Amino acid sequence: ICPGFLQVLEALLLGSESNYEAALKPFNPASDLQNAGTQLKRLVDTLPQETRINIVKLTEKILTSPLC
Amino acid sequence: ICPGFLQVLEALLLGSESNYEAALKPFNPASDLQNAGTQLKRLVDTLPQETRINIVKLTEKILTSPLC
Ligand SMILES: CS(=O)(=O)c1cc(Cl)c(-c2cc(Cl)c(S(C)(=O)=O)cc2Cl)cc1Cl
């Protein structure tokens, strides 16, 4: 799952549209499910710039939190 | 990283607030980084109900996509 998911990590924060949904193509998200992923991208293109590098530089401290 | 991250998966979609930030406590997200995680929760409490079970039932089809 690590590999199949980054194309969405960028299409989500480092993307704007077309790459996020097209990135979900290989995942063939259910109907509504995909719908939620589309808006998921909007919320990303609706925040400032620091909030962008933040959730991107934040999801790492929450998931891949270095240190112990 | 699989384990340390679900407390946020629920605090994010199955949560509203306090559990999401408090869930990031153990991850000690940087300053702004955490800021982005706070709004991250708002965007979740700002969508309908199907969009909620969707991104939750969607992030699985994108990441843990069954089948091949
Ligand atoms: C399935 S999806 O593509 O619609 C999706 C939706 C969300 Cl909310 C996140 C997400 C997940 C988390 Cl945990 C955070 S955070 C690092 O702010 O908690 C931010 C975001 Cl945008 C990630 C993805 Cl890939």
From Swiss-Prot, chains A, B:
Gene encoding the protein: Scgb1a1
Family: Belongs to the secretoglobin family.
Annotated source species: Rattus norvegicus
Record note on quaternary structure: Antiparallel homodimer; disulfide-linked. Interaction with LMBR1L is controversial.
Keywords: Disulfide bond, Phospholipase A2 inhibitor, Secreted, Signal
Main localization (coarse): secreted
Biological process, per Gene Ontology: negative regulation of interleukin-13 production; negative regulation of interleukin-4 production; negative regulation of interleukin-5 production; negative regulation of T cell proliferation; negative regulation of transcription by RNA polymerase II; negative regulation of type II interferon production; regulation of inflammatory response; regulation of mRNA stability
Location relative to the cell: Secreted
Role description: Binds phosphatidylcholine, phosphatidylinositol, polychlorinated biphenyls (PCB) and weakly progesterone, potent inhibitor of phospholipase A2.
Stretch of the intact protein here: 23 to 90 of 96
Any one annotated GO CC term: nuclear envelope
GO terms assigned for molecular function: phospholipase A2 inhibitor activity; polychlorinated biphenyl binding
UniProt keyword Secreted present: yes
Tissue: Club cells (nonciliated cells of the surface epithelium of the pulmonary airways).
Induction per the UniProt record: By glucocorticoids.
Spans traversing the lipid bilayer: none
Protein name: Uteroglobin
